[PDB]
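[job 0412] stage=fold_complex status=start
inputs:
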Amino acid sequence: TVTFDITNISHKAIDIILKVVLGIAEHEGTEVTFHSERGQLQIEVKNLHEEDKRLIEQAIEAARLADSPDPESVARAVELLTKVAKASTNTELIQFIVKELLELARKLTDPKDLAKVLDSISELLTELALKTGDPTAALAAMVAHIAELVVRLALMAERTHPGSEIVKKAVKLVQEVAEEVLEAAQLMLEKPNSDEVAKKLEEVAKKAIEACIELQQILEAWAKERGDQDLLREVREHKLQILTIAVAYKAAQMGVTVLKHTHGWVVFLVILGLHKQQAEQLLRFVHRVAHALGVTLSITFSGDIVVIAVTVGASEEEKKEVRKIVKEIAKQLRHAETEEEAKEIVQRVIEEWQEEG
Amino acid sequence: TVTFDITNISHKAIDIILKVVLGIAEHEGTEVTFHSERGQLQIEVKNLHEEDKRLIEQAIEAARLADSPDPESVARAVELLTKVAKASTNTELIQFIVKELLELARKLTDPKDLAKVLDSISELLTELALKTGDPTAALAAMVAHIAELVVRLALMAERTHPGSEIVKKAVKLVQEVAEEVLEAAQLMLEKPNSDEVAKKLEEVAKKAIEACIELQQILEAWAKERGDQDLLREVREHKLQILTIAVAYKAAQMGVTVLKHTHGWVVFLVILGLHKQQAEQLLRFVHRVAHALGVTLSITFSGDIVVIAVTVGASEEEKKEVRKIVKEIAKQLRHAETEEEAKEIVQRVIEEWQEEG
Amino acid sequence: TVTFDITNISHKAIDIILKVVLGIAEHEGTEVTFHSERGQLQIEVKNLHEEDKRLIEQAIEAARLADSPDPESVARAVELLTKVAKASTNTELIQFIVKELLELARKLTDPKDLAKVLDSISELLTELALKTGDPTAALAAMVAHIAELVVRLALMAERTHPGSEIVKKAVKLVQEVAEEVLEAAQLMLEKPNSDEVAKKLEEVAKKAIEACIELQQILEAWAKERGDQDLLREVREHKLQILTIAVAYKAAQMGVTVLKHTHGWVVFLVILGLHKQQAEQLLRFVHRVAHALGVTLSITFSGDIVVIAVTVGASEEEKKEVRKIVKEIAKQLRHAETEEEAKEIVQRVIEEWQEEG
Amino acid sequence: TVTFDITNISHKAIDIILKVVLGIAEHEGTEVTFHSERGQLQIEVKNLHEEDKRLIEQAIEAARLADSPDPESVARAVELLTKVAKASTNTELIQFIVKELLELARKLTDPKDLAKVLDSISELLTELALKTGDPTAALAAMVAHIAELVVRLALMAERTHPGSEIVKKAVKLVQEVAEEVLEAAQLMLEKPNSDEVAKKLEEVAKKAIEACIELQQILEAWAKERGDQDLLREVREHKLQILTIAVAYKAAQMGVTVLKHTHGWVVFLVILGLHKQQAEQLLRFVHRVAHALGVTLSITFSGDIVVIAVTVGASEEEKKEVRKIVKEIAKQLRHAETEEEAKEIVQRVIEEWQEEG
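[job 0412] stage=fold_complex status=done
writing structure:
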């Protein structure tokens, strides 16, 4: 017989523990006893397996921290609730954790800690994708990578800024996007497999990309005021990654396959199996986002194939090589049927050229 | 032949009398006849006997009372209309009686009349259970019993207090409960065998439990001022009863079987046939209500079987024997298949216990 | 051929003329040929009836009157439009006439023309009965007849009263009832056999009966102050008539057969086939109206058959004659199984009463 | 290969170009290449035809002009986008062109540039009729012809007395009518082959007819204040054409055949096969419109044939000939079955009559 002890604990925290304990006991098909003394709580269980024991202890630790006002205790609680969700077989428990997490996010005000919680939200969405098996949650995993890029930009802001009303605007936008994301995470569990989830997720993705563009402008302005060409290089490399995942998101909303590569001052994407309407909507989204980012493009289209090359500033003598590569990719892709060929073709084009990169 | 009169009466009182006369006359089916006058009535039906005549007399007495301001006349009227309902072959006469009660309740409030009103409402809900066969009326009977026990607390308030703003607040709360119950009674007649009755009755049970907790605190606070250990004993026994009925009510909303026992300082419940979601709701309801009441719980779970027991104020030495007994009750219950065996098993634990007590 | 001139009346009036003139083609798929310019019109037809020419003449005269302020010209026009409607094979022309009647009524203010208008509205509702073939229109015909008897009372008021704010209230009430009746006449053509027609007609009847009661009380109060016992006898007989018709209306809305007789200071009704619910509502309606009128009822129920009789001002001796007659009519009608036999039985009792009246 | 250049333009103008280039690549599916930065764009396409190259060039010229505030550049842009739409394989390109037309019209405040836009709207409605085959678009082509007569009226206002507060009122009316036409075009674009488009078009036609009547008042009042018999002739001869189109428009809501002819001071129409239930709507609409225009109509009908003759006025000795002609045409039309007969019948009557024409 295993036994657990819980003290100074709220009704809210007891609700989590009862959901967990009864959920685990129903999974095990086993007997449970609960005792209370003057509002303290004790729990006893038969034939329990060790990770389920550890999960009850971890839920207990999480709930004991969740009653706190302390933001470090919030970050650790969110990490533990994330571990509980990452183990979870139970949908109502995931729903209740998502609802607790929305409140735990709303507790935070400061970017240094909000980074920890956004990383945890990425893990939450990662598990939610594995739980649902749904391309609508693969979009949420791409939005999580956009948020992870927002966290990397936030860490750059911590590395550089003294604090200002621009940082207050930034953390408000980030916190608001975090709330918009967790509202979509709730909606995905309240209406699984529905078009309204994709509509909300597109409004989320739009809002996130616009926030990213503003964060890039903030960091670029700070880099231009200080003359920091090295920070501007790091940010430039992140611009390419942001557009990469943004393109991945739009392609995934259409449900088409994507392959991608990086080499210093140039980044490449190949997209396969497109059609007229999707291709136009994508190319519109690409050109609008790229124009807002201020990044130099080369693109080519052949109905189902789309090739996108995204570039940092370079000489025209360097841009000639990108112009060559784009036409060379469009030559070499022309007879393939499967992504394992396409990967080898792109690698072959690289192996036929890379000395000039 | 039967003949009756009025000195003066309202048109609504005439409508009740006419509905009663038409009903009692038509019941003979194959031959019926009667006549009226501005202030008189006569019936010519062959087959009618004493109780048919007495029902018209009782309706006429109720009608003569119904126009009055007098609350004693109200209490007598609701009793008479309850006697009419208890005989009634038809629910639309009961709809008229409920519409009258929805007016009659509002006129005034005092604990002694309020008690007889809520008790008569319990009787009307009892007849409504027999007319409908719908367990929402049995649920409402448990709620009305809870309310009636609350008016026994109000009679103890008359036993102990000269009256105050807090007592007038309590009177408003119980008057709201009486209104909310009567609204539920009218709704149940409009929408039998539906979920909206269960939702309204849950909002009644919520308000009722909160009013119970409030009144129990009002009396407990006076008992803690005046040192009244005997009033604490009565209030503790009533607390335990209210919780016992409330747990039975919540289990009856799930439609499961309940068995009950009582020994003063310790009180026992067994519940049979619970689903996963039913248990996960029930045990949280039990916890929140018990922790609001301040009572000392024991709970254990075995899938579809749940055992609950409750105590107050037992020594840390006496608590051991209760917790032993609770674990033993579960150990005894494991092999059972029918309700008579469970009754005999719990009785056997009691019949083995009472030699040592 | 036929040829005519409009002498520069409004184009609104031409709308009616064109509707009528083209309407001539409906009779046989009729070979109408036509010419017009600048308010002069000419027609030729194969086998033209004199009635076609009279309908053209009637439409012309009605159109010529329709621009006028004058109430007598409106009363003449309403009669002509009624005379058109009473020939009409076309229902849209009747809808157009109803749309004009709404405005024609609201223009008018004065008793004699208002009487001819409401009388004509009864004729228009009579034609609506002949067009619909439905007893729903007979309900309106009884209500319109009641209103017409109300304007006969208003003519007795004009014959006697000095004019007052009470008369201005009376005119306003009759105007409202007229517009409510005409709204029901429009609704009968827009939504035939809808439940909304039965709802609107019942509201019209309810409102009209309350206006009847009010006007009957207004005239009775003035006739009491003037001292005219003979005018009070007429008014009381007109009360009894309107009550009699109102009972017939309510029973006809229930869909059941009614038979009627009038015999000076006492009036009689028989109704065949009332359900319990119908008998209950009819008894409520009868009682409420009777107390609002101040009349002495007598009623008996014998299965689905109901007998009603009414009086005022009977001596303590003549009250015995009513009780005798009512008991006897019931006693003989208890063996009655057909309409002509029941008519003969009621006649036989009343013919035998010539030695007692 | 086609290769083309784009100096600085709006992202809307880029969106149009991409919609066009991809919307052309629709046909052959051949490869496309793009290069860009935040102020410049360049495009290249392979295995593409001369007419496709012209469409690309025309879209390029349209995009280059579309950002401009200049009214002449707006007129040319709508003309070019129309010239693209007039060949289009792609429905969404028409949708986008019309959507930007809404704003391109709202930008204009010049009567002659708005006239080129209204002319282009007639062409776009012509293409929309050729795309849909919908009689609701043929109705709109008649509304566009009314708008051409509005344009001709506006050009006569410029020819005579521009710039007054009365002309500013006219400009507001024409701009409102243009907006109402364009919003009706958007509704037809969103929901082809549905009754709500015809109900919207009726509001447009109503406003257009009222605007035409007002423009006729404006010109005729000035013409009377100059004594200008030739301007009175030109305007009155356009009144005939306005009524001619208005008749055809209303008849096209039934979808019936219409034939029309002109000879100096008189204009004639014939309408074939009207069912009575429709004829009663049409004849009334015609007579209402004619009375508002103030023109001396002669209207005739016989069975299902309607003959309309419009006159500006002459002596009774001239009016006799129109009366004779209308009667004779009605006699002559009796036996025909097809429009090639009817044209020749009317032409034969006119060619026999023109000795007094």
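[job 0412] summary: Chain D is about 70% helix and 15% strand.
[job 0412] exit 0
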